[PDB]
Design an enzyme around this catalytic site. Sequence first.
Site, PDB file in Angstrom:
ATOM      1  N   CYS C  39       0.823  -1.200   0.000  1.00  0.00           N
ATOM      2  CA  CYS C  39       0.000   0.000   0.000  1.00  0.00           C
ATOM      3  C   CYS C  39       0.861   1.255   0.000  1.00  0.00           C
ATOM      4  O   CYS C  39       1.896   1.323   0.668  1.00  0.00           O
ATOM      5  CB  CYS C  39      -0.914  -0.010   1.222  1.00  0.00           C
ATOM      6  SG  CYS C  39      -2.042   1.377   1.379  1.00  0.00           S
ATOM      7  N   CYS C  42      -0.540   3.838   3.109  1.00  0.00           N
ATOM      8  CA  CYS C  42      -0.710   3.179   4.396  1.00  0.00           C
ATOM      9  C   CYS C  42       0.471   3.389   5.334  1.00  0.00           C
ATOM     10  O   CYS C  42       0.333   3.150   6.538  1.00  0.00           O
ATOM     11  CB  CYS C  42      -0.958   1.686   4.186  1.00  0.00           C
ATOM     12  SG  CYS C  42      -2.522   1.342   3.353  1.00  0.00           S
TER      13      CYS C  42
END
Lengths: 483, 34, 116, 1070
Positions: C39, C42
């Site tokens: 990600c 993230c």
Amino acid sequence: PEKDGLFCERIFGPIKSGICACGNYRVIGDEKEDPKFCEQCGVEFVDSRIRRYQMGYIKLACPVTHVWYLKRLPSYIANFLDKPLKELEGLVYCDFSFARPIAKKPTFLRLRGLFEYEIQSWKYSIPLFFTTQGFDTFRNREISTGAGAIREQLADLDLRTIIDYSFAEWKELGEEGSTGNEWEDRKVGRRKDFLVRRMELVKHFIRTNIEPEWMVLCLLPVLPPELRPIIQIDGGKLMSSDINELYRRVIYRNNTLTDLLSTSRSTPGELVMCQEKLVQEAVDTLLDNGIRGQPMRDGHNKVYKSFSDVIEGKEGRFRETLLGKRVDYSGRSVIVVGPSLSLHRCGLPREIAIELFQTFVIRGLIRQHLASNIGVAKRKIREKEPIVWKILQEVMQGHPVLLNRAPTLHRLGIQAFQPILVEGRAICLHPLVCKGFNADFDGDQMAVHVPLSLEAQAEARLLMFSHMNLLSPAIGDPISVPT
Amino acid sequence: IDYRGPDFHEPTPNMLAHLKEHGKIISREDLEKL
Amino acid sequence: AKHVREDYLVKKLSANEITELVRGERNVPLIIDFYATWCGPCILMAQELEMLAVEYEKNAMIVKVDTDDEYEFARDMQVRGLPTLYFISPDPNKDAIRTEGLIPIQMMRDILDNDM
Amino acid sequence: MLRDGNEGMSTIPGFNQIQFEGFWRFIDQGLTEELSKFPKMEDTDQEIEFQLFVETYQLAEPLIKEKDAVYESLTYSSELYVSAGLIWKTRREMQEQTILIGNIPLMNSLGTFIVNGIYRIVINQILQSPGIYYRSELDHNGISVYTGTIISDWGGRSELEIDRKARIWARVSRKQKISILVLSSAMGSNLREILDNVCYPEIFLSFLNDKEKKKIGSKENAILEFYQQFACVGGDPVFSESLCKDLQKKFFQQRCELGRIGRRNMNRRLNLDIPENNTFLLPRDILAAADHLIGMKFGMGTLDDMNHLKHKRIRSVADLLQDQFGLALVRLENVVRGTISGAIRHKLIPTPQNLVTSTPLTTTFESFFGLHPLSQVLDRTNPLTQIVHGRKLSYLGPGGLTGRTASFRIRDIHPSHYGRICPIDTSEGINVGLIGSLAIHARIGPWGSLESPYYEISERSKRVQMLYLSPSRDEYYMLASGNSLALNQGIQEEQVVPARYRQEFLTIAWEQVHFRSIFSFQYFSIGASLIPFIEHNDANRALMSSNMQRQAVPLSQSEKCIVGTGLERQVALDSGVLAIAEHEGKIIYTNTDKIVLLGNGNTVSIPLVMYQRSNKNTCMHQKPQIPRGKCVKKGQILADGAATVGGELALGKNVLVAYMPWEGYNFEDAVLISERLVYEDIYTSFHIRKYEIQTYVTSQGPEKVTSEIPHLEAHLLRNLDKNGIVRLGSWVETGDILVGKLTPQMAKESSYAPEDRLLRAILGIQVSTSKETCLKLPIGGRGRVIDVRWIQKKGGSSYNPETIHVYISQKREIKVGDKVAGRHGNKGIISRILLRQDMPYLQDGRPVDMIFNPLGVPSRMNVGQIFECSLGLAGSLLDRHYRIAPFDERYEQEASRKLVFSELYEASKQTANPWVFEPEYPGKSRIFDGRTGDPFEQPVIIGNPYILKLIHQVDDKIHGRSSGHYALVTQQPLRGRAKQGGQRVGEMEVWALEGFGVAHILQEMLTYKSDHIKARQEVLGTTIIGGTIPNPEDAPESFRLLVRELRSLALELNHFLVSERNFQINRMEA
């Protein structure tokens, strides 16, 4: 120290001016009627300068061959005796020989022999043939060993006969054609050179005030104590000299030699030779260490600083002690650029000038009756009185100073200038002379010197000013041009 | 400058404190001697 | 082991442990973080959650779930994007909250203070 | 063991892992591998026995603290306890107990050891690794000499050579023992059937088929043929036990212990197959070496390089500490041997602790940290230098090359110090190219080899595409350094990029690239990576650009740089100056002596460093960062430090600068600063000097301390306290007494000079028996006392010599003569300081803060400053800071130009200042004259560069001496400034004075102002009063000393003055 020692005050001067060995003091101050020796003390009260000039002296109970004349490249002893170097090197040191000195005394003993002692059989072979009638009446008459036989041989041969014989040998060699074998080609040349240097040395000996026997010395001089001092530090720390160490070793081994020889009585054999040659090797190490096969080292796995080490070297004697001398009236600084200065002018900081012309300011204060005594004048100087700078702006006008760039490269690296007092901590230098000094301003240091003598001031003003040195001596091109 | 983050290494451990195993306090050392 | 402090406070839990935590009795608000290593955004969410876990020393419990490990469980929780946070009230009467995107930390504080 | 493996492969690793990892490896394994080497020593009487159980060792928590370790000049260390008993074979007993072997020093968070209150660091060393190296150095005749040298772990060389198909010989040393045979000292099948393993064993097979005789046990029996014992003897050698043991080092012990690295290198070069645990010389090894040597001439073959990093190894703190521990254990076992020799004749039954004392370990480690050249005092000039010192490599030290016998090829950049050793950071002077730094991403891998990270290109996408390559694996891959931003009408995979194959620089298609370096901070060190726009600076200037950042003075108040490279943050983190939180929680208490945090129950107090002294006399002043109540995670910043504003390093200040020749006051490398830098404290730093004075116990008395001194000026004792030491706050000047101790002088009225007696009698001065002993302040060194320390001794001696430390600080401004330097090698000496109304001003009226010389740019060829200059301006007008990585010309062409010009235009547009970006000569503007109101005819480049202040201050370089102390022997001014010496003139200087034809000047620099005992006094006399200075007669004392030590060699040296009017000899006395 001690009586009869490395720092023996009895032979040298007093350790203090006036204080004798016991401790009493006599006022002399003059070269007049005064007891030269203080009876029980026997020590003069003159200054301790004589400490650094008095010479010590020791006696080795064996002749000692000087290292320079025996161990170095073509030793002169070999040419003097017309003998191979291995032979004389076995006569001593290795001691694997027994020389025969031909001398004044008759030779009723049959034949001469030269030397032969390297075979293990000789331990008990010759005693059946040797002696056979007393010990000193045969062995001590002749056939000597060690440096004694070498010195006696040095004291025996006649120089004129040597010259005649070597001339005859040269004539004999010169009348041989040869030129057939390479070994024969190069054999004659070395021998002829040997003969030529032999007659050269002999003729030099003949017409001089120097005797050959002096190369095999018997009495060892000892360097004055003060020039090899032991530094006294607080708490009892001592920074002695290695010279003291080799000297102590030499005299102790010589004392052991004297004890062994004076106690002859039951005369021993190889022990006397071993200890005598150990003494000889100790003297060899003391004189020229680092030239023998095995250099002795102290308690730091480091070789001692020999006398030859002090004499020879870019940091020892004859190189910088007699040439590179730190001088008074000098001070480092940092260099900045001043475009307002004239060509005949530089700029000195106020802090530097007061520590170079201090004594002339002491003049200015005493003469002008603004101060009375030396201490009073120095006290006035130390408190930065406003009249001090008027004096150190008044005795500097007309007194040139030599400015010197620390990495001197050419002749124009040192130049005289007329200083003026500037405010700050940096020396202001003229920009045109910078290429004369090859000096930039990224951070550099310049040393100042003050000529004191009137003649020196005349030299500095009339010969080293940057207005009569405007041309380089290379080809005659300008040295100060707009950069 | 915010440490930790994506472009900084892990925090440096105190060397004495990092020695978790090969290190004991004085009290335990005294206890184990008798 | 009590000698050196842990660098990271958020503890990673499996799906079953999260089910037990939600089903079992609780007295403090619960935070569930959905994240993956690949990600992009993230990392910032992880840093902000790490900062938030320090201010709320013992008054809240913060855990994270890796969708690369538990994919079906994340799908069942109605997750349609990686930077997702779930706020669970300590009581069974109040319903849960789902937040999507890189939300500011201050709004997170408002969420678990004025709404949980 | 291994930490998170992706360190250095995803982030820049901390600049501490070398020392930290070395010490941890030592503690974890070297202790075990050295305790096992401790023998089972015992007595020859079969009566006692000593044992040291190995798997029981542990360390103890240190008693003292690091603050107290440096506070009392102690040694921060931990006690080593090993459990092991003593066995007595008198009642067959074994008393088991835990003993204290000794003390071992410990590292702090900085990577240093505190030994005797001194911070010390261990410098890594580079040494030739064990293995086989082939060479050929030719001959004057034109003969090729194929040498097959073998190096063991200790350095045992057993060369092999062939001379036009000659006999292979094991040359031991010098030119002696020319042995030809390969006999075994066990099994060597010298006959046949195993030697015929490569191509042919004939090579003059035993000459006449035996050369003497055949194998049996030896080629003449008696072990190793007839050369069993041929090393040195006084005549003929005969086999003996001592000789055999001595020659075992040359045969087996010290010439066949290859070790791990040696075995690996031998298995690599000769391509053999032996288990890696076998670290000894096998017959097949020498057989293959001889085969390779003979085959080298026959076409195929290659010669090794002595400079390739694959043939070198690195020694760090781990190996040095292991060797020191081994020496300490040897000393310990010798001590126990002596004790057990003395433990029977005294008829005592001692506990094991009585057989072991902590003399060997403690003294061994103190000697190591005090005498070893690889352990050096930590440099703490600024946070940068602490980091820089730890990461160093050197060929010098024990067992390595020196600065005199080092060739010229070893002083060059090999094409292998690329990802491992920085190529632009070395040490100037004689030891150039022998001392260097480490690359930022470099890491000491297995077998002491430097490794660098590289991104592997492969069509599998394994998991982690980055690898740590070693020099041996580096030259056989094609390491690209190009880009994928190029597209042609064909396919992208045929585009050409520069690469590095073998040791050359090619240009290859993308399809044959194996690895790809991706890091900008990979080929440089810490010093060289702090230069913005380094790609625009000549590589010649980079050395001094890096070297002038380690001389920066941490100023009072710090300021961050507008333009930087982004590495300052990690340097600040790893310097150790910061105070980073070791726990979570909230800052619940802050005072400017401490910060108290509360987190996870317990409460943690961190004490700040208010004011201290560095090894280079500089302050270390910390400061809290986060206010009360806020929270911090682990590892975040809590407090600032010296020259570390924010979380970033900050060694200088941003100042407005215009490049122009003002009036010649910026000639060459001079700078022209304004008054604004001296009244706003822009460049102002605190320097703390430490004056230490001790006392001694003489014969009369132990140098009693007192507050009064007889016949000393009371004004000089105004600040002296009643105890005898000046108290805090006194503005002590030069010559003022700090600590005065009445050393008991002898009642030596006899030794007193007659002048002293006259002064004391005529003026009534009393006669005292106390020497004037006090710590008078030297020239300069003024300031305000900030700290005083008084301590004594406590040991076996009943007397306590008291030592006093006085800390004198001084707030030094920036004045004419100081050194201000930039980050691009543009040094300078401040020449003038102008009032603000006397300096050029821009078109907004702001006066310029510094004026540089433009001509310095074309000479040194460092354009990178100019960019920074312009860029700085933009930052100052936009409230933004740039952190630009080097080599930004990869994205674009002339990318730095685009960045600078776009930023300048944005700053000129957002704030309406149309002079910032003039669209006819961008980056330049037309400034005016501060003293005429006229515009300088041509536009001038202006900016806001980051200028530092250097440690070479003018007050540390001034000098002056009229007279004073002279050397005991040479009778010359002593030296330098501490001893109030005089400047030296020699060699070239004299050659100049002779060139000018000045004789009096040269004469008086050798006689008067030098050696003359009697002439210095008379010039002093005739210079206090005034007269005509008389030329001297006697030679200086230098000639007297010369004749003195030429007398000690039984040689004369006599001077003579044969008169021109009487021919009478006038021999001088010397």
